[PDB]
Amino acid sequence: NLISEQNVTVTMDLQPVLQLGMQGSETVSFVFSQISEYIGGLTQYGAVDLSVSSTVDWC
Amino acid sequence: NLISEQNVTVTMDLQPVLQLGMQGSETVSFVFSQISEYIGGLTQYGAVDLSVSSTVDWC
DSSP: OOOOOOOOOOOOOOOOOEEEEEOSOSOOOOOOOSHHHHHHOOOOTTOOOEEEEESSOOO | OOOOOOOOOOOOOOOOOEEEEEOSOSOOOOOOOSHHHHHHOOOOTTOOOEEEEESSOOO
16 A cells, blocks of 8 residues: 655644633722711622633632 | 587676665754743654665664
């Protein structure tokens, strides 16, 4: 079986892509100006929304 | 038995023919331009193909 061949090398670089994105402001400001603000505290709902993408099992 | 003869001399020249043919580029180049190239290393598959012909037992 006389042959003539050409060889290629396939190099797959499986990088560990971990991508955590956020859809909120980087700076979260708490301004305490009222007495009710002090006594009851300040609450901001949904300040950050994290979307997660990952190659590997993550925590 | 009276005769008349003509003599021809046959000279056998058994030369030791060794023939190693190659079907690859003479220059094999390794270019380490990326980090993964450094870390995982560079591999080139089937860079050289050696075809062998020989009169005598060879190594």
